[PDB]
Write a protein that binds this ligand. Sequence first.
Ligand SMILES: [Zn+2]
Ligand SMILES: [Zn+2]
Ligand SMILES: [Zn+2]
Length: 241
Amino acid sequence: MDVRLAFPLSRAEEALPRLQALGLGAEVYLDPALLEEDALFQSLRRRFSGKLSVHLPFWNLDLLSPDPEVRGLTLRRLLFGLDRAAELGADRAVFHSGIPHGRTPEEALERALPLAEALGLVVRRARTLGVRLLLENSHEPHPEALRPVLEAHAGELGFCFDAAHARVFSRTPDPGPWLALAPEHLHLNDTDGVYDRHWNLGRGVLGHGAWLRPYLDRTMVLEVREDPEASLAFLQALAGE
Ligand SMILES: [Zn+2]
Ligand SMILES: [Zn+2]
Ligand SMILES: [Zn+2]
């Protein structure tokens, strides 16, 4: 199994020893404040070899923001993040759609093709660099608003499924409709069904045993804020039956 630990670049020193010890890959979140810090990228690239992907910046970003300066910043953040991903030898880079929380299905759907268009330069940059670009669900109420973005890009854009985001932020809490988008990348954790807890698998309400087994051959990222061993042990028991 390709199982990776999520951590911010800002906590790499702290997460690396634990990665080694558990034989995990990495998905590194590119702290916007740290994007220009050449030495941190050099240090990481030397100190880790093993499968690596990145989470592109996302906080307060949206390619379709009504604020033109936010749109500009968002584009710069995604493109620079992709440069850094390539430097770290990342296979994949994950990003959010930028959709605000609480849009209606109609509002989310209307953003789909404008988003596909706005992603033109980002998809092109990823292609040039040899980095696979993945869109993750966040606040979309239903997977139908992501489907046209994927289709417009005709296989050049992949999907990362985060089940907790569907459960706590969307109007489609069941994993089924989201799984129908064929995620190649899974963001794994558990939640109480109220907050995006980033707890270990087995600790919450998502019932991964009921739906996750078919996806164990895909890249899985433990997006867990506590020690991730319990999730790795969950995955291993799931894999053995
Ligand atoms: Zn994410
Ligand atoms: Zn996620
Ligand atoms: Zn989350």
